[PDB]
Design an enzyme around this catalytic site. Structure first.
Site, PDB file in Angstrom:
ATOM      1  N   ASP B  32       0.811  -1.204   0.000  1.00 24.97           N
ATOM      2  CA  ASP B  32       0.000   0.000   0.000  1.00 24.97           C
ATOM      3  C   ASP B  32       0.860   1.276   0.000  1.00 24.97           C
ATOM      4  OD1 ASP B  32      -3.245  -0.366   1.061  1.00 24.97           O
ATOM      5  OD2 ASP B  32      -2.461   1.693   0.922  1.00 24.97           O
ATOM      6  N   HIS B  63      -3.978   5.755   3.892  1.00 22.31           N
ATOM      7  CA  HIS B  63      -4.673   4.559   3.436  1.00 22.31           C
ATOM      8  C   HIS B  63      -3.997   3.256   3.958  1.00 22.31           C
ATOM      9  CE1 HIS B  63      -6.021   1.533   0.504  1.00 22.31           C
ATOM     10  NE2 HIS B  63      -7.186   2.170   0.615  1.00 22.31           N
ATOM     11  N   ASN B 154     -14.509  -0.745  -6.349  1.00 22.91           N
ATOM     12  CA  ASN B 154     -15.585   0.113  -5.885  1.00 22.91           C
ATOM     13  C   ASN B 154     -16.364   0.695  -7.059  1.00 22.91           C
ATOM     14  OD1 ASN B 154     -14.605  -0.283  -3.239  1.00 22.91           O
ATOM     15  ND2 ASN B 154     -13.479   1.630  -3.277  1.00 22.91           N
ATOM     16  N   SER B 220     -11.293  -1.719   0.087  1.00 21.73           N
ATOM     17  CA  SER B 220      -9.963  -1.586   0.713  1.00 21.73           C
ATOM     18  C   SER B 220     -10.012  -1.963   2.173  1.00 21.73           C
ATOM     19  CB  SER B 220      -9.470  -0.144   0.636  1.00 21.73           C
ATOM     20  OG  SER B 220      -8.703   0.127  -0.521  1.00 21.73           O
TER      21      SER B 220
END
Ligand SMILES: OC[C@@H](O)COC[C@H](O)CO
Ligand SMILES: C[As](C)(=O)[O-]
Ligand SMILES: [Ca+2]
Ligand SMILES: [Ca+2]
Ligand SMILES: [Ca+2]
Ligand SMILES: [Ca+2]
Ligand SMILES: [Cl-]
Ligand SMILES: [K+]
Ligand SMILES: [K+]
Ligand SMILES: [Zn+2]
Ligand SMILES: [Zn+2]
Lengths: 110, 274, 114, 274
Positions: B32, B63, B154, B220
């Protein structure tokens, strides 16, 4: 034909109460004008869509990935496009996805 | 002052932790934006950076720290609680400070994870088309015994259109969709034949830089729950293969509706780790 | 009162009642930020009038010429306003029975002086 | 080659004309953009101009010629047919070539009509607020026995908002709304407590410069039907007072719905001229 447009980037899915992040104006007539920072490139990219603004999303960056957090951002286009009235919008899952899909397109380079 | 996010009891991770299985000795790589290693509720024991100028133990986005906290937030008297709080947590920085990452960067991170003996790869990221080097990297990781997990995407639903992104769409990767506290599919959760399992992805409270906490939405947030669940299973039954752990997670999932929208259903780590 | 915040607008005059196929007669752009900009011929006067409506563009029709009459034939003409009005998204339109009525009702308002 | 516009049988003007009453010896002033007096289907016998460099017997716009033809187009073998084809037609130019007129110009026209013995005033025009001079001019015309008719306006409806314009809104004036060939209210027709009667105002075919014909919409087209109907009544019963003619037109109108939208209804000159 001549164009007189307002482009915006809004926080959300395109609801009327959505917060405006940025907006610009563009005029494509005798010359390329407006508060847009690169009017000539934006008019050229605008006219290239041949009245179909979904063509602004036709060249996404094929080498980029984005984090899969959902925080939608929506691009809007309103006004006169080559002599015809337009009201267009497109939602992206987050600003990373917007940036990758638009891939430095001059219209949303503001 | 420790808060248990709704996702921990929803996937029944609290029941497995109550048995004394918390992910100890299991290596989980979070591919990430990095991880804020200095966060008091996280313990980063290693990793690598494939983002020029950035260190792996820093997270200039947030994130990566959030995703990591869903996996491994420490069992103490502060912040939150991860699905597998005793895991060996590794920060594999493949996304930069702005969230952007390249396919070649992701490939470098997956290969690092494979060579450095990671048990689980979490990829809370996605692209629309994938790459041949990416397919190869995830096929090799899974063939070499790594449980490879990714956010399904998404992109929501539109008729019968398949909206699952890459790397989640590859057969060697677990495509994870998002449900809410009521086990209802989040409207943004991607759909399609590759959708494998669901996990909490709406209103997910977790760690965030600098030394704080945030609530985020996305596949996520769902993906690290399945990554952590894989770590719990392996801490209880260490000699199970990656495909056995993967098969236990989909076989014991709570049926929620059509597989196009929910995959096999909401993961149940209590039943998966039996 | 008066509104605050930036504006980025497109104003048009169209032949008809506001249908999407309606013929555009004229259009202009206006930006109201540190300075009044756009292709609008009188940007500062147009921004000043806009801010004075306090987000309610129907206030552009509040000062009609009190001494004019028009023939009562129906041939609709519509004014539109789209974009950001003092930080808020707007999509506004007003239909007049004919061009005489438009001219009399707007009464040289700077916003539609283009 | 004579065409009867739908409005003449709709208001039952053809029935009154069949009795032999066509408006003969009744003076009707059309306060407008003038009238193309050289039109073969119109006979302009006088008038006045209150516009710059234009004669009363010319129409550089077309609106006035159209309105006049609805009142008075000649009963012959060409063009169209007016409601009252035998009226003494007077062109009172109060609007210029672009259709615009001033309140003082309208006042001058109304006073001319009152001093020159007009029986009926038609005003296919409107302003939003009116004036003390305009109220005085219409009140004096009606007090001196002139039937004063005006277009109600083309401002439509919005909830319960009263959208009647001036001079139609004054109590001494007949406010005329517009219906179509199905006696349905035209969407643009103004609404309010002062709406008195309806008449055809959608797709009204009439005279137009130069020596031609056109189809127009508006309460402008409705108003001359009521002006012509007043002339028919007066050609049959010349000693009735202006209020008696006005009360016959509203009392015998065909009920079409709520007075807010339709006034008393669609005029019926056959019943009104009994
Ligand atoms: O029919 C002859 C007319 O001049 C008489 O009408 C006079 C009117 O009531 C006053 O304008
Ligand atoms: C639109 As404002 C900030 O003046 O209330
Ligand atoms: Ca904790
Ligand atoms: Ca997969
Ligand atoms: Ca004729
Ligand atoms: Ca009245
Ligand atoms: Cl006309
Ligand atoms: K309106
Ligand atoms: K109006
Ligand atoms: Zn303010
Ligand atoms: Zn009788």
């Amino acid at each position: 034909g001549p164009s007189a447009m307002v482009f915006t980037v809004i926080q959300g899915s395109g609801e009327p109460t959505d917060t405006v992040l940025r907006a610009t104006t563009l005029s494509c007539a005798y010359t390329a004008e407006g508060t847009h920072p690169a009017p000539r490139a934006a008019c050229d990219a605008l006219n290239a869509t041949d009245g179909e603004l979904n063509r602004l999303l036709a060249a996404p960056d094929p080498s980029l990935v984005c984090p899969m957090y959902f925080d939608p951002v929506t691009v809007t286009a309103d006004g006169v496009l080559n002599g015809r009235r337009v009201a267009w919008k497109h939602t992206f899952s987050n600003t990373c996805v917007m940036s990758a899909n638009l891939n430095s397109n001059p219209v949303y380079a503001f | 002052a420790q808060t248990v996010p709704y996702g921990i009891p929803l996937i029944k991770a609290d029941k497995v932790q109550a048995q004394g299985f918390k992910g100890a000795n299991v290596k989980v790589a979070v591919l990430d934006t990095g991880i804020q290693a200095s966060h008091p509720d996280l313990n980063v024991v290693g990793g690598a950076s494939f983002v020029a100028g950035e260190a792996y133990n820093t997270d200039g986005n947030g994130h990566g720290t959030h995703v990591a906290g869903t996996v491994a937030a420490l069992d103490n008297t502060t912040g939150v609680l991860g699905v597998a709080p005793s895991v060996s947590l590794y920060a594999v920085k493949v996304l930069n400070s702005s969230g952007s990452g390249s396919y070649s960067g992701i490939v470098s991170g997956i290969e690092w994870a494979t060579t450095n003996g990671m048990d689980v790869i979490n990829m809370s990221l996605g692209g629309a088309s994938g790459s041949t080097a990416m397919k190869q990297a995830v096929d090799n990781a899974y063939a070499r015994g790594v449980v490879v997990v990714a956010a399904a995407g998404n992109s929501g639903s539109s008729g019968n259109t398949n909206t699952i992104g890459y790397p989640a769409k590859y057969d060697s990767v677990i495509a994870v969709g998002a449900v809410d506290s009521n086990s209802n599919r989040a409207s943004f959760s991607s759909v399609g034949a590759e959708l494998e399992v669901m996990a909490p992805g709406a209103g997910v409270y977790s760690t965030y830089p600098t030394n704080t906490y945030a609530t985020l939405n996305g596949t996520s947030m769902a993906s690290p729950h399945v990554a952590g669940a894989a770590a719990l299973i392996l801490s209880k039954h260490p000699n199970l293969s990656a495909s056995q752990v993967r098969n236990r997670l989909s076989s014991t999932a709570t049926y929620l509706g059509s597989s196009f929208y929910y995959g096999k259903g909401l993961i149940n780590v209590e039943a998966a780790a039996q």
